[PDB]
Structure 1
Amino acid sequence: GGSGDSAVKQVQIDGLVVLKIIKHYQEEGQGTEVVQGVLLGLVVEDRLEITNCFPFPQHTEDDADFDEVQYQMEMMRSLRHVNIDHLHVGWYQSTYYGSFVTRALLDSQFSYQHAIEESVVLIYDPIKTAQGSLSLKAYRLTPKLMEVCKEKDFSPEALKKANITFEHMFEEVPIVIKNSHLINVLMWELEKKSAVADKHELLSLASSNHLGKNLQLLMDRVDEMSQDIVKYNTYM
């Protein structure tokens, strides 16, 4: 077997989910934090197979703001009623920072993982595109903090939890290792998009050239690293 701690297995995210993630643009503005959708999937061969997602919207006029769960309830029935399921084993976001598991995402995750333990959180490398490694990140919450879950303490009572010394460099599972079995219709797109005409391949390849020559990519990443990281360093 290949399990971590507790009953939760490794995740896999089907390309059909990744395209439904990527249909949402980067363009909210400069940047604001929103949970962009829930991840729906089931325990199968080696993994939790995420089969599909529906995007979970929020108000985006300047700041973000919430709305009634009439969306999620009606939309999780909309996925059920074609053929029968509702299976929220995680959620995802594509916010500007890079990949970054903030204290609020840890609190939102703590409420999520204590309620349903067969779950993971997803982040994706945005149109920010530094792109060296790991375009998709998984992360589970440790069982050792979930055993002491209600809320944290604005007082020294946290010291009894701190002496468990639970992980904060904890393991992240490898999402993709083997074929998702629904590769097969998009495999049959490739010959039609490649063998007979130049019209449809080159527009996916042209992006790399201008990821090098265009304005200040690594320079702006190291500039934001000169701003994000020194603010965290000074704080500690």
Structure 2
Amino acid sequence: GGSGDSAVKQVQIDGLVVLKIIKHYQEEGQGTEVVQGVLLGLVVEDRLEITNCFPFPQHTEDDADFDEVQYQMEMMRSLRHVNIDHLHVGWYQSTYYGSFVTRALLDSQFSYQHAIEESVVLIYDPIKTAQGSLSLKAYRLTPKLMEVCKEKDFSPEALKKANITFEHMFEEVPIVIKNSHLINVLMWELEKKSAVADKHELLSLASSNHLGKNLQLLMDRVDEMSQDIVKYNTYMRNTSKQQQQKHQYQQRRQQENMQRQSRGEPPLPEEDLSKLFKPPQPPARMDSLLIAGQINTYCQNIKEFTAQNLGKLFMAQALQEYNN
């Protein structure tokens, strides 16, 4: 039983879903992360099976602005009438820069997961990550955080929920290994559109050639990763700096002031002695980096592990191919 934790099984994303994702591929939300649709499915053998999606559009002029839910309500009735029902068991934002689970995506997920615990959150990653590995990134939210439910505030319940120490390298389910049983029709088209009408097959396959030759793919990956990751690294370092200074470096001075008092005045207070430690905002363990930021350490290691791999393959192929 590969099934998930405490309300749900795995996910299976039927091919006709992913066709409909790559229709709103990476536009209508390029430089803006836009939730491009809800994943509607049903509980199947050892898995969910997302059998259909409908896209959720928004006001994408160059910024994203949430709209009336007149769309979603009418469109989930539109699904219900010819097909099944509104059975939203997840969602997919493709969207912007190879798979990354932002703090906002963790928060939108937290609202989604606590409401319906039959859920995953997809991140459909096409050619942008140099394609590359883990094109379909699933990820559901730890049921620990759905038991120490809201909210991770800056001082209380940052420290306290950091001390509970729920996962932030948390498991991601596999998505496909099996016959989906809607292989059927698209199987029949393969013999037609190979050999005797392999126009559109060969067109798709020869995309590979120009994924290598031209403008700066791995170069631009490593460039964007030279900027994206150093931003995040610097942030933790100056975050950690100030908090560790309130933790120790301020205790150092005020306790050396506690020296001077001699730690007690018998006739009257001890105002000064009392008014040593008066709270700065972090007493320990700023949580939203420790959890949500660390979900993106994992994703940044993934992007690095992805961008590496196709490099490794060339470093075999290049040497070897010329060696003849």
Q: Provide the identity percentage.
A: 100
Structure (1/2) with the larger strand percentage: 1
Residue ranges of structure 1 left out of the alignment (5+ in a row): none
Deviation at 1:2, TM superposition (A): 2.0
Alpha-carbon separation, structure 1, partners of 2:52 and 2:83? 13
SS in 2 for 1:144: coil
| Contact in 2 for aligned 1:40/1:88 (Cα 8 Å) | yes
Deviation at 1:114, TM superposition (A): 0.2
Alpha-carbon separation, structure 2, partners of 1:97 and 1:105? 14
Aligned length: 235
| Contact in 2 for aligned 1:9/1:48 (Cα 8 Å) | yes
- 2:100 corresponds to: 100
| Contact in 1 for aligned 2:29/2:96 (Cα 8 Å) | no
TM-score w.r.t. the length of structure 2 is 0.70
Deviation at 1:202, TM superposition (A): 1.2
Alpha-carbon separation, structure 1, partners of 2:134 and 2:103? 22
Greater displacement, 104-113 / 90-99 = 90-99
- CA 1:29/1:213 → structure 2, altered by over 3 Å: closer, same or farther? farther
- CA 1:37/1:159 → structure 2, altered by over 3 Å: closer, same or farther? same
1:148-193 CA-partner distances (Å, limit 9, x unpaired): 1123213334322222110000000000011100000000000110
- 2:207 corresponds to: 207
| Contact in 1 for aligned 2:211/2:217 (Cα 8 Å) | yes
- 2:149 corresponds to: 149
- 2:217 corresponds to: 217
Greater displacement, 140-149 / 80-89 = 80-89
Greater displacement, 39-48 / 24-33 = 24-33
Deviation at 1:33, TM superposition (A): 1.2
Deviation at 1:217, TM superposition (A): 0.1
| Contact in 2 for aligned 1:26/1:127 (Cα 8 Å) | no
Residue ranges of structure 2 left out of the alignment (5+ in a row): 236-324
| Contact in 1 for aligned 2:151/2:157 (Cα 8 Å) | no
Alpha-carbon separation, structure 2, partners of 1:93 and 1:29? 9
Deviation at 1:4, TM superposition (A): 2.5
SS in 2 for 1:200: helix
TM-score w.r.t. the length of structure 1 is 0.95
1:77-121 CA-partner distances (Å, limit 9, x unpaired): 000011341100000011221100000000000000000001000
Alpha-carbon separation, structure 2, partners of 1:29 and 1:140? 23
- CA 1:187/1:44 → structure 2, altered by over 3 Å: closer, same or farther? same
Greater displacement, 225-234 / 131-140 = 131-140
Alpha-carbon separation, structure 2, partners of 1:197 and 1:104? 45
Alpha-carbon separation, structure 2, partners of 1:39 and 1:184? 22
Alpha-carbon separation, structure 1, partners of 2:29 and 2:48? 34
